From a paper:
The JN.1-sublineage KP.3.1.1 recently emerged as the globally prevalent SARS-CoV-2 variant, demonstrating increased infectivity and antibody escape. We investigate how mutations and a deletion in the KP.3.1.1 spike protein (S) affect hACE2 binding and antibody escape. To investigate the effects of N30 glycosylation introduced by S31Δ and two RBD mutations (F456L and Q493E) on the structure and function of the spike protein, we determined the cryo-EM structures of the recent SARS-CoV-2 variants KP.3.1.1 and JN.1.11 along with engineered variants JN.1.11 + S31Δ+Q493E, JN.1.11.1 + S31Δ, and JN.1.11 + S31Δ. The spike proteins exhibited three conformational states: “one RBD up,” “all RBD down,” and “flexible” (i.e., one or two RBDs disordered in the density maps due to flexibility).
To investigate the interactions between KP.3.1.1 S and the cell receptor, we also determined a structure of KP.3.1.1 S/hACE2 complex at 2.9 Å resolution using cryo-EM. Residues on the receptor-binding site of the KP.3.1.1 RBD are highly conserved with JN.1 and form extensive electrostatic interactions with hACE2. Several conserved aromatic and aliphatic residues (Y453, A475, P486, and Y489) also establish hydrophobic interactions with hACE2. The bulkier RBD-F456 side chain shifts hACE2-K31 to form an intrachain salt bridge interaction with hACE2-E35, thereby reducing its interaction with RBD E493. However, when the smaller side chain of L456 is present, K31 can move and form a salt bridge with E493, which is a stronger interaction than the hydrogen bond between K31 and Q493 in the presence of F456, which explains how F456L and Q493E can synergize to recover the binding affinity with hACE2. Thus, we also observed the epistatic effect of F456L and Q493E in KP.3.1.1, which together enhanced hACE2 binding, compared to the substantially reduced binding with Q493E alone. Our structural analyses of the KP.3.1.1 RBD/hACE2 complex and binding data are consistent with an epistatic interaction between the F456L and Q493E mutations in the RBD of KP.3.1.1, where Q493E alone substantially reduces binding but, in the presence of F456L, these residues synergize to restore hACE2 binding affinity.
Residue numbers in the entry:
A (entry chain A): 19 to 614
B (entry chain B): 336 to 482, 484 to 520
Amino acid sequence: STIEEQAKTFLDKFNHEAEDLFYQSSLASWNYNTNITEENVQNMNNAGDKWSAFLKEQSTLAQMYPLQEIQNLTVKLQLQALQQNGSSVLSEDKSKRLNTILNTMSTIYSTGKVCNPDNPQECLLLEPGLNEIMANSLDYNERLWAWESWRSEVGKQLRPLYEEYVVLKNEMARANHYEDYGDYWRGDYEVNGVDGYDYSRGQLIEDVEHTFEEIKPLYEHLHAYVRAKLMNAYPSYISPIGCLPAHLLGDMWGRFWTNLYSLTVPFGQKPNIDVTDAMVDQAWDAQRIFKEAEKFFVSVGLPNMTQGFWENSMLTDPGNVQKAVCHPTAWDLGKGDFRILMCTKVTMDDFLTAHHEMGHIQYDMAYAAQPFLLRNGANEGFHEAVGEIMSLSAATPKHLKSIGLLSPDFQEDNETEINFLLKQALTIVGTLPFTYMLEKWRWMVFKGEIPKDQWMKKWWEMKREIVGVVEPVPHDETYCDPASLFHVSNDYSFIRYYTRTLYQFQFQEALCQAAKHEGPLHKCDISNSTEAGQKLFNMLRLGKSEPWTLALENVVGAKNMNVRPLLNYFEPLFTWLKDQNKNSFVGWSTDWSPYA
Amino acid sequence: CPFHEVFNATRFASVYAWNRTRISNCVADYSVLYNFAPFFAFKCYGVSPTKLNDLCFTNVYADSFVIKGNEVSQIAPGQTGNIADYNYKLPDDFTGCVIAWNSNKLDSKHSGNYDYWYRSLRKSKLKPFERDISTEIYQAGNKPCKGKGPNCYFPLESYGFRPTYGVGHQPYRVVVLSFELLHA
Ligand SMILES: *[C@@H]1O[C@H](CO)[C@@H](O[C@@H]2O[C@H](CO)[C@@H](O[C@@H]3O[C@H](CO)[C@@H](O)[C@H](O)[C@@H]3O)[C@H](O)[C@H]2NC(C)=O)[C@H](O)[C@H]1NC(C)=O
Ligand SMILES: *[C@@H]1O[C@H](CO)[C@@H](O[C@@H]2O[C@H](CO)[C@@H](O)[C@H](O)[C@H]2NC(C)=O)[C@H](O)[C@H]1NC(C)=O
Ligand SMILES: *[C@@H]1O[C@H](CO)[C@@H](O[C@@H]2O[C@H](CO)[C@@H](O)[C@H](O)[C@H]2NC(C)=O)[C@H](O)[C@H]1NC(C)=O
Ligand SMILES: *[C@@H]1O[C@H](CO)[C@@H](O[C@@H]2O[C@H](CO)[C@@H](O)[C@H](O)[C@H]2NC(C)=O)[C@H](O)[C@H]1NC(C)=O
Ligand SMILES: *[C@@H]1O[C@H](CO)[C@@H](O)[C@H](O)[C@H]1NC(C)=O
Ligand SMILES: *[C@@H]1O[C@H](CO)[C@@H](O)[C@H](O)[C@H]1NC(C)=O
Ligand SMILES: *[C@@H]1O[C@H](CO)[C@@H](O)[C@H](O)[C@H]1NC(C)=O
Ligand SMILES: *[C@@H]1O[C@H](CO)[C@@H](O)[C@H](O)[C@H]1NC(C)=O
């Protein structure tokens, strides 16, 4: 009758009640997102409140089982999951104020709008208006207008809230025995109590910085290439030696360079692989796309989808009568009920997305046997890393030929491979300095290294040093540029995207070894090759029951993050870019700006 | 024999309080067992299914209960889990057949059917064919237990059955036929 046995009894009761309440909450959420109506809003909120009240009661009860006497790591991990109070550690007034601030920021971002000069009646929302301007317009002044208007009208409403937010979140984090809120976020990667696999919170910062330095030689060449092409697009606005203007990168924040592809195409006289016409000519629909994804997973040795998946999932747009959120998601409702919510259209992008979301569902299925509190990925970056390797494999020409969408006699050559790799580099590599610099900035803000009076001054210096992007106009301390992004205004961890990207390649290379693949890594197809499927499955079924360093070692042969698989993936692109840049400056000066 | 009153019944008993009906002084016909449902499992341990009509026994008992699909593998000699240990346990030396079928269309409701209870906490393992329908509060801690509380748990939990759950969490109706031989 020791404390460990009482804790195990407690957790068993928790897992049963939690599965029932969680299921009810997840189903109500599903019903709302697939059938949008006020009655479902009330049902979603009532089930959500029931779930939250349950967790608060169980968290309170969980404080009676100290972890110091517990020897079993599974029990200790489940108790850690329940004992943290989070916002419950704050006084009632600060908690209501913090939730007010978070709701205010969400409201300001979601409904923020700007108006055309001298035309108060013609006003654009971030989506689709400004995003469309930033993605498709080639008029320098229009792009700058959208940039500045968003930063002034929205950034200056969020700034004082971000200051109060940072203060309240740091107080909360300190009350939970963390150095700052940055350590709260980095606690997701903490391993403590497994000899040889331990990973401190502070260590995460160092590892990210080391991987970034290794990446730098590749990024600097990609950046320089893009600069030359943009010089032709904007002949009088880009310095051959300086940073790129932030508003010219193809997005609102410069998070991705994917929309610059049409200007930077290596060999523009040849097409990219696009099998949309093949899917239309063959009379494909959403059902065949999902069945082909299923065949992909079955081929590698993973299980078939359940009957409930095919009967309850919403794979097509319900139509004009029944509204739904057309944002692809993979749902695990608990107790064996797995669903995908997508508004599938016949296009190659949705084909790959179907593989991505199926890649998530297979993961949710693999760890379904774990205790309720451990039914998640090893860390925040594993779930998407798995989905991305599934998308990455499905896209290779070998796959398209084998399924029958790419012509049997299509002949790949090096110019097509370079066009493919540049597009991938623009979406995978061009986003890493952004994610690193942004997360690093927040860490320094929460820690207290950057005083409030220099938040933006320091922000722009870092952007120039790490990313190579310079503001087109100066900004004083009344602006809040970081908060103009969804993942900053709302309380989300952004490091997920840097870490996940490296994992994506670490897994893919190891699987390619299991498949006995020869030749360039980017052409690797892990179809069939049941050794790769079993290798991945052995990790996927673990959920959170093991340290992420071990879950990673079980697939790639290493206990930490690395970058070599990524650099190898893009190796022929790096060589090509080095060749293209022999007459160009590689790197950048931080003194030049469009302003001066 | 009246096998249809066991297999074809409006409601099966909860596994914590399984229904043991005794069949005696009768002529059995086991081919009718295949007229009630497609079965998840029909597994005999001490007898051959195809020879059931050639044996004579003094008593046959039909143990009727509802369990989860993932728990069907526990109705067997030598198994462990919340059911093999705390609700219904077969002896290691067992003569009989374990019949299970999917009942999702009859027992599940959208709100959730909470009228099927199982035991998860007990002081000791059950003996073969022992039944315990007590609702006393289980004491997990060292302090005397007075009602529900910090280390005081109700020993029974209900299964929430809903038509959309995966196969492993749908209700299954299980009938175990135990064949007993004595005299006459
Ligand atoms: C993984 O293995 C499967 C087999 O288990 C491979 O699928 C098979 O691919 C071949 C082509 O390489 C198919 O043969 C062709 O079928 C078409 C049907 O119209 C026919 O016109 C061609 O003349 C040829 O016979 C074969 O049918 C197909 N098998 C199945 C069961 O679908 C698959 O290609 C392998 N994966 C990869 C990436 O290659
Ligand atoms: C930690 O506790 C879990 C139970 O919560 C143990 O898992 C059990 O291990 C036994 C080993 O014989 C199995 O038969 C059970 O089926 C397992 N149960 C569950 C729920 O997984 C685990 O082994 C314990 N670990 C340590 C290191 O003591
Ligand atoms: C939030 O979590 C902490 C532990 O992480 C709780 O801390 C204990 O609370 C009890 C009262 O319930 C105190 O007697 C203990 O001294 C606390 N322990 C520590 C380590 O200080 C805390 O109670 C929880 N928050 C609230 C609001 O109760
Ligand atoms: C996965 O499910 C399918 C049904 O969706 C199973 O059945 C096969 O389906 C394909 C569909 O093209 C048929 O061509 C095969 O003939 C079917 N097989 C049989 C034996 O009839 C498939 O077997 C299931 N696979 C796994 C691994 O569970
Ligand atoms: C959508 O929700 C409303 C809520 O009243 C319900 O009546 C309707 O049947 C639901 N429709 C679907 C397709 O789920
Ligand atoms: C492709 O290979 C040919 C071989 O002659 C070479 O001349 C050409 O430059 C290569 N192109 C790329 C993009 O690597
Ligand atoms: C079977 O269960 C019913 C209630 O569901 C009960 O009335 C009946 O007496 C039980 N039969 C046996 C043999 O225990
Ligand atoms: C079971 O009972 C129902 C009525 O409840 C009847 O319609 C059905 O035919 C019966 N089935 C068998 C196999 O006796």
